[PDB]
Design a protein around this ligand. Structure first.
Ligand SMILES: *C(=O)c1cnc2ccccc2n1
Ligand SMILES: *C(=O)c1cnc2ccccc2n1
Ligand SMILES: *C(=O)c1cnc2ccccc2n1
Ligand SMILES: *C(=O)c1cnc2ccccc2n1
Ligand code: NI
Lengths: 8, 8
DNA sequence: ACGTACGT
DNA sequence: ACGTACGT
């Protein structure tokens, strides 16, 4: 859920 | 992610 | 419900 | 001259 590299 | 000239 | 982010 | 960055 976090987006820091993928954002899902 | 390393910062030695951009640091991202 | 998954990998992105740069230039001296 | 070099890899760090999280939860909905
Ligand atoms: C977001 O909160 C989150 C948490 N765990 C995960 C596991 C795998 C893919 C995506 C995820 N996203
Ligand atoms: C993004 O691509 C990415 C990959 N690995 C991680 C590990 C821990 C926190 C955030 C991350 N983001
Ligand atoms: C940092 O760890 C890192 C890794 N690879 C990259 C590729 C392109 C731009 C920035 C980057 N940062
Ligand atoms: C910073 O500007 C910079 C430019 N290119 C690089 C290539 C390899 C390692 C570190 C670098 N830092
Ligand atoms: Ni470059």
């Amino acid at each position: 859920x976090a987006x820091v590299x993928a954002x899902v």
